[PDB]
Ligand binder design. Structure first.
Ligand SMILES: Nc1nc2c(ncn2[C@@H]2O[C@H](COP(=O)(O)OP(=O)(O)NP(=O)(O)O)[C@@H](O)[C@H]2O)c(=O)[nH]1
Ligand SMILES: Nc1nc2c(ncn2[C@@H]2O[C@H](COP(=O)(O)OP(=O)(O)NP(=O)(O)O)[C@@H](O)[C@H]2O)c(=O)[nH]1
Ligand SMILES: Nc1nc2c(ncn2[C@@H]2O[C@H](COP(=O)(O)OP(=O)(O)NP(=O)(O)O)[C@@H](O)[C@H]2O)c(=O)[nH]1
Ligand SMILES: Nc1nc2c(ncn2[C@@H]2O[C@H](COP(=O)(O)OP(=O)(O)O)[C@@H](O)[C@H]2O)c(=O)[nH]1
Ligand SMILES: Nc1nc2c(ncn2[C@@H]2O[C@H](COP(=O)(O)OP(=O)(O)O)[C@@H](O)[C@H]2O)c(=O)[nH]1
Ligand SMILES: [Mg+2]
Ligand SMILES: [Mg+2]
Ligand SMILES: [Mg+2]
Lengths: 336, 290, 290, 290, 284, 285
């Protein structure tokens, strides 16, 4: 029942989120890793200073502050008891962005299985933010934050809270939490795999252009022009360069981790993508299937139906730079 | 006031309007819940005249709520003189007193954009009377601003209250507690896949296939929006009125006319919707043009 | 006055300019969304004179929404008189009365940085009334602070409204989808590729290579700006206003002048824009300089 | 007044100063950004009399913004005379009228710590008006609290605006890129490795050996600060003021004098800059002493 | 200069720093006599025991620019512009230039210090004091009417270092203020001499310093969580023995449970054993 | 009164030792502990005269402000007047009698913002700074003729409750000036047992109930985070209904279980009805 060592997965999430030392931390499990960055990350932010958003405040005060709203005062007759309804912009840290972090820290502390040091340090920080109001977290809160007015650094740490919240399970106790066994599910791991690659390819392969391409069937049907019944087809990634175009279909499977029969059903999707795609330049068309393996990496090339197709693997668990080395080495072969 | 004038032009099925007419006589406190551009404001002006059976402005009143709207203007309150403060009968107080004169004739009060202001701040004490069961002079109460307990106000049974609420904003996910008890929510469909909306175009020199081709995509698109719940619920989906307007000249519908709407209205809206996946914008925008 | 007069100096293609009047004449309320420095403020005063057909200021009104405007400021509110308050008709209410003074001649209301203010708060009742269909006496509605005697405020047909929302500040973006249906949104591009921009430099003592080199680099940059959507979206892409001005004295455009621009204005923006690696900052700055 | 009077005590190069007045005469709006202790406040009072060429403070207005500052204070707002409220023309409004009286003479407004207060709310109407090409009556605009459309405010051409913002806090930064466009941003550096800084010390009986040891040290340290732009940008680096003042009595700057201040001021500052690293604090602190 | 438990060198630093720089921040844990130090010190700088010159306030999160400097606030008739204390105080000192007038701000960390000071955050620096540096105030009706700090004014800030708020860091204010740490001073003889001149046992005083130091050093062990700023102050011992009860082990036992025990909880939160351990360590 | 009070005398003796010196004090304990009734008897004890006039009581809430507490402007028939608050009036009453100890009771203090309410005076109530030396003119004191100083005689008691898990860490202001005291329910105390045996209660019935509640009091505080020691049930519910004229009995207790402990038991857990039912059933028999 093997899975990737937990530390390296964090690197994949980083590219997936589009943006540190993990050697120091001794906790193999993920939550020690993720909390340490969050616990440390807030400390990095606080050094520079946390975000302060001008929050308008309209209230009943004993004097003029900012702009008096004449209507609310006269209607409430606050003049008689020497009061006014006035609008002013107090500058606070109680915004949604900061509130999410603080409530998450409660979840992080409440987690049943966690390093002692991480739990202790977070509890300090939780106290260190007295003004902020705790909240009950939902994706709807994170949904509102798609504006991303905050810095690039904030958006990274916020994404971490999204992973924790959704991948938090109550455990033995009603109050406390228990972390999700994320590695076991392939589907999100696959969506991690696909998203990890797409943003990764933009970074390293500056030489080539990397875009996801939607595809349309060559078919015509008398019944419907819509062809809603037909399967929707959107590439995982397309990595187009002047010399050669290349489409990749990659998925995370448990069977392939075993070094026997081979699970390559995704290939069935791939061929039809090649067909429906027509290149104006007509330089060439190439395909690649890349999967994660644990032990070692194996590469083959094939010439199937007039298309040049590669099957390849990566030895995850080796080392992240050598893995980073291997991926760039891989594409150089096929991108030609 | 014939239904034929009322109901022929409409895109809505005759079933739902009848269902609406049922509950409205029954409960008299109704809310139309749908995205903007489906004729919520459009129907309600007609609906009032349906019930009365006549086109009468006096018996029908329309307002739109906003944050500045308050009890003191709505119901009763004090307005400054040059120095002094004079009490003034508000709309609903003045409006009901007309209804008190003629109990038989139906009276209609229409409140658009109700969610923007809290009902309690405006209505307040009168929410007790407003409910359908507790109406009539039996339940009379003296007002906050009544000079004496003798002066009393009761909501006459004849008045019906209509509320037009749009499910297009994130804040409205937490619907106000005041509304839910007292009003009956009804959902208005986008109403693309309807005969009359199509027939409206066909009378306006439209090809059926171009019309029929469009609806599947619109029906397809709104389905995609409703599938989401986190950012965009079912209530956010597109209404049918972008396409209605702009044909007053007689210019025939076509991709040329349609493309103007897509780029100038629907294209940036999708950027707001699909901020996270700009390519998703490209997916649909290219899909619609084709 | 005519289009030839306006489009003499404007860097925009005629294509949008006719599209603008097309949507306006049908819809009567539109918004131009683009990054700062693309002549949004610049076109707006010229546009007003086109539709009236004359260069008249009286029929036009220009304002800016500054996140502190209110319904009391726009429409109706209470102001102190010497000792006691009085009701003051707002500017828009003051404006509409002028527009209905003569329906024949069109009247324009211009709002800079409209996205800032909470439009639902300011307009209130008008948010429905502004739309083309629901105009005139038929849709007269009584205002909040109107006298108890029925006095109603209706948008004249001749009135046209224009909004000016920059695309930089993401937070200050229109999420009032109910309001976004009244308006039609017109994207404006930076204007680098256009010859009408290029001619403006070449007429002003410029080399075609230096001009053609400039547009090549900027267009590369805006693609890279357009590449991202996480932080820096398409809308953030750089405007042409920086290059437009400062040559009135007779200073010919050259790398010296361009170098002053890059170090002084753009180079701060870039480091503010990225704030992840200086290399990207060092890269693109040197690219423009080299 | 004359130019050389200012430059005698000024550590910044004239090259930057010449760049500054060139922009300011053109742009009329500028922002000076650097760490605290580099003479932003110092230069600004000097700079105004340079631009006017005559030492007239009446034509100079100097203010410090903060959270408790608004459009009502700055521009216009209603405030209590006593029993009766009145419209109080804010300070900037009054300043602009003064400059109108004498259009020839330049009038200067100095805003210290501008980045603190919400400029978006404060400037508002001004945010459009202030730009170099939009000044004058042609672009006159009525304000929020203006009695009618005719009452309008236009920035005079003679006015010059100065913006002063520290770079220490990323929290308080001018993220409004539209606001960024009006202002021309000129960075200011600590300028340790300058003659005029050294001449000031040698003039006050300082060792040239100690001076060369001093400037080299801080130059390396400040460069270390700029390196970790993710953590601490170049804007965070130490200014020259700590060493500047404190010798007024005539105390010679020996190594002991420097060792005293480092312990009292920079040492806790260093502790804050390196919360995680005690050795790095120990490294650089000990580096200075030997 | 007699009953002070802080080193004579440290106070000598301050007077030289204060007179020159005119602004300081005195930061330390509670129970180090920050209030008494400045009040003792303030009379030194004046040279006379004058309390009218000296005014003290204790800031708090709700404290505002309305309170400190200026503000519009109601009279019986209506609203008017009300000069806050500092405007009132600086005018009073401006009336008499020669003498040195002092302003003391306690619990300064609580308020958003930038917000409160506002205009004077620039003006307070020693060089920018005078009519040349005057500015019209925020609420000033007229541009010509301005406010400038006089040179005689000197400012003292008292800071609790045990409640860090990771909300706002200002390094510019740090330029205005010269930060001076204060240690509890258990080791100092003046603290010991006070008790030995109160009929304490010689060992009992010596025993206490060993006990406190072992605890205090542990607090400063983990600079990230806690620091020397967190460690315990001495002032709790000063109070309560002037009634006539000389020190005894029982009296020590009272204070540990009375005062320090919550502090331990505050400090060593969710670690009772460490509290029980360190508590019991002192009692033995 | 000591015999009437159910809490340990040592705590009673300890408190008088603290307050006399510290002059500011706050009691945090479970609801149903007689915290108000505790302080009043203690208030009468310290003065020694059983004087209610010296005693004044206030209950705080979130709206409570400086105008309510200290001073504010209230409308006249025409115009408005400065209107003295409670604490301003109360201390000036105490100012006349310096020898006489005067006490102030602030119930549910933690709800309101002390700073907003007290403001200026929040430092003046600190025992070190008392008397005319620390006099300050008030915000609304237009003239400098009169300044407000709390005289030494004043003692301030704050009644706080450990009932609510929603409550976060106490405000920093409070911790500084106040000594925090935990009050026991007092089931184990003999004075409470003599308060039932004086009512002809069975010793078995008396002793069993002490053990019964203690079994619960341990379990409610056994929870690490959500339910602490402060949560555990107090005795005040048991007092009311026995000396009115009706003797103790298990059926009398049986009603009390349903009345207060049963909903309270639901309130604390709010997760498991069986865990409530098990405990409620355990209590009854
Ligand atoms: N002919 C015709 N027009 C319709 C129909 N439904 C809506 N419209 C048109 O759509 C436009 C706007 O309708 P409206 O009621 O205001 O939508 P709304 O729900 O009120 N908008 P909002 O929610 O933003 O307030 C009008 O031109 C209206 O006549 C319809 O069924 N038939
Ligand atoms: N001559 C000329 N100048 C142009 C043209 N387009 C923009 N500019 C110039 O660029 C500067 C700013 O234009 P402006 O309308 O204010 O852009 P904006 O979008 O309104 N600014 P903002 O978004 O910040 O409000 C002015 O100098 C303007 O004249 C143009 O086509 N011709
Ligand atoms: N004598 C002299 N002093 C200088 C010079 N430059 C800066 N200073 C001194 O440094 C101190 C601060 O000046 P200031 O402008 O306020 O620095 P700043 O960047 O504005 N600081 P902040 O942004 O925090 O307000 C003063 O002592 C000032 O006189 C200089 O060239 N000569
Ligand atoms: N004799 C003497 N008393 C001191 C000393 N330090 C503090 N005290 C006394 O301790 C009591 C409380 O001091 P306080 O200012 O409230 O503590 P702090 O504000 O936290 O530093 C007062 O009586 C102080 O004078 C000292 O060094 N010597
Ligand atoms: N006789 C007597 N009554 C007590 C004692 N303790 C509490 N009580 C009674 O319990 C009631 C007050 O309880 P309390 O907790 O203050 O009510 P709460 O303020 O609503 O929480 C009164 O009937 C008190 O007399 C006590 O020790 N002796
Ligand atoms: Mg509507
Ligand atoms: Mg503009
Ligand atoms: Mg300065």
């Amino acid at each position: 029942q093997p899975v990737i060592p937990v530390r390296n997965i964090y690197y994949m999430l980083t590219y997936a989120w589009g943006y540190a030392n993990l050697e120091a931390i001794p906790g193999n499990n993920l939550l020690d890793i993720l909390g340490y960055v969050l616990n440390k990350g807030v400390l990095q932010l606080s050094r520079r200073g946390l975000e302060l958003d001008y929050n308008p405040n309209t209230e009943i005060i004993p004097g003029i502050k900012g702009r008096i709203e004449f209507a609310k005062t006269i209607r409430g007759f606050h003049l008689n008891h020497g009061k006014t309804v006035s609008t002013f912009d107090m500058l606070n840290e109680d915004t949604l962005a900061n509130r999410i972090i603080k409530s998450t820290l409660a979840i992080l502390i409440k987690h049943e299985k966690l390093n002692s040091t991480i739990r202790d340090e977070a509890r300090s920080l939780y106290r260190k933010l007295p003004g902020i109001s705790t909240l009950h977290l939902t994706p709807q809160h994170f949904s509102y934050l798609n504006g991303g007015k905050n810095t690039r650094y904030y958006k990274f740490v916020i994404s971490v809270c999204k992973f924790i919240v959704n991948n938090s399970i109550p455990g033995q106790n009603k109050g406390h939490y228990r972390f999700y066994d994320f590695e076991r599910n392939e589907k999100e791991m696959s969506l991690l795999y696909q998203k990890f690659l797409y943003e990764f390819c933009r970074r390293e392969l500056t030489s080539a252009n990397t875009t996801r391409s939607y595809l349309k069937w060559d078919a015509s049907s008398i019944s419907d022009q819509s062809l809603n019944l037909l399967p929707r087809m959107e590439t995982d990634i397309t990595i187009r360069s002047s010399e050669k175009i290349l489409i990749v279909d990659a998925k995370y499977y448990k069977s392939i981790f075993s070094r026997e029969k081979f699970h390559s059903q995704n290939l069935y999707q791939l061929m039809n993508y090649l067909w429906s795609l027509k290149p104006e330049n007509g330089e060439n068309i190439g395909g690649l299937l890349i999967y994660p393996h644990v032990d070692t990496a194996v590469k083959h090339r094939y010439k199937i139906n007039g298309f040049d197709i590669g099957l390849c693997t990566v030895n995850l668990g080796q080392e992240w730079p050598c893995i980073h080395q291997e991926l760039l080495d891989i594409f150089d072969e096929y991108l030609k | 006031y014939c239904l034929e004038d009322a109901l022929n032009d409409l895109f809505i099925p005759e079933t739902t309007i009848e269902t609406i007419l049922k509950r409205l006589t029954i409960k008299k406190n109704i809310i139309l819940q749908g995205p903007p551009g489906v004729g919520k404001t459009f129907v309600a002006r007609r609906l009032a005249y349906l019930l009365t059976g006549e086109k009468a402005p006096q018996r029908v009143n329309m307002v739109q709520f906003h944050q500045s709207y308050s009890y003191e203007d709505f119901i009763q309150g004090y307005r400054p003189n040059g120095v002094g403060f004079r009490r003034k009968d508000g709309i609903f107080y003045n409006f009901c007193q007309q209804a008190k004169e003629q109990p038989e004739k139906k009276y209609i009060f229409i409140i658009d954009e109700i969610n923007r202001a809290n009902l309690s701040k405006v209505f307040g004490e009168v929410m007790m009377l407003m409910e359908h069961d507790k109406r009539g002079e039996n339940w009379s109460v003296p007002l906050t601003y009544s000079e004496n307990d003798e002066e009393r106000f009761y909501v006459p049974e004849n008045v019906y209250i209509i509320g037009l609420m749009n499910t297009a904003d994130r804040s409205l996910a937490v619907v106000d507690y005041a509304l839910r008890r007292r009003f009956s929510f009804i959902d208005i469909e986008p109403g693309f896949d309807t005969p009359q909306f199509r027939n409206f175009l066909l009378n306006k020199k439209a090809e059926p296939s171009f019309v029929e081709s469009l609806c599947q995509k619109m029906n397809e698109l709104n389905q995609e929006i409703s599938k989401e719940a986190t950012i965009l619920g079912k209530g956010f989906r597109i209404g049918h009125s972008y396409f209605c307007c702009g044909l007053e000249d007689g210019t025939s519908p076509d991709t040329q006319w349609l493309n103007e709407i897509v780029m100038t209205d629907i294209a940036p809206l999708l950027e707001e919707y699909f901020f996270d996946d700009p390519y998703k914008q490209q997916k649909w925008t290219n899909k619609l043009l084709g």
